[PDB]
Design a binder for this molecule. Structure first.
Ligand SMILES: O=C(O)c1ccc2cc[nH]c2c1
Lengths: 99, 99
């Protein structure tokens, strides 16, 4: 699809068999999803976030569906105020900026 | 142009007659530019950046060139480690996310 930026670029995602909405964020290196139960192994991590630093669970090789487009890659799970699709997954679905 | 996201989407900008580089950031509502002299009146805001909070000065009607494209809008000036072009300016240059 072609998504203009007149409002936040929010889309529907599927992750761990659950439908959520998420922000397509070209300024994020990584993908950060809200606290949820995920099938898969995780390792502990800390990342910078809104107003400070947060503990996250890093899940590698997660199947995630972004507006109908399949991606497999790293998802960070923790107390993010917004579900964020970062470049690690935007590259997998072939997302580009155009102007 | 059509910009892939394998690295951070950095472009050259021109603001206050100074050449800089900046991150095209679809996850940002606003534009945040590092400490610099803008010839205008301003109003103080706070923004929750990655790692903590900063105090910024809001400047309106700032003329800016982004990757060759002329835009006018609001810029927040403060101690940010990265120049951020947010949606308020990305809309002005006709930027879209495509996949
Ligand atoms: O999920 C947890 O219980 C947990 C505990 C500690 C850390 C440190 C980074 N991530 C964590 C997750």
């Amino acid at each position: 699809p072609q998504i203009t930026l007149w409002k936040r670029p929010l889309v529907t995602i599927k992750i761990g068999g659950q439908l959520k909405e998420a922000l397509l964020d070209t300024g994020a290196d990584d993908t950060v999803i809200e606290e949820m139960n995920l099938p898969g192994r995780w390792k502990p991590k800390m990342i910078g976030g809104i107003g400070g630093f947060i503990k996250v669970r890093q899940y590698d090789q997660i199947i995630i569906e972004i507006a109908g487009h399949k991606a497999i890659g790293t998802v960070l799970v923790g107390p993010t105020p917004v579900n964020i699709i970062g470049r690690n997954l935007l590259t997998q679905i072939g997302a580009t900026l155009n102007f």
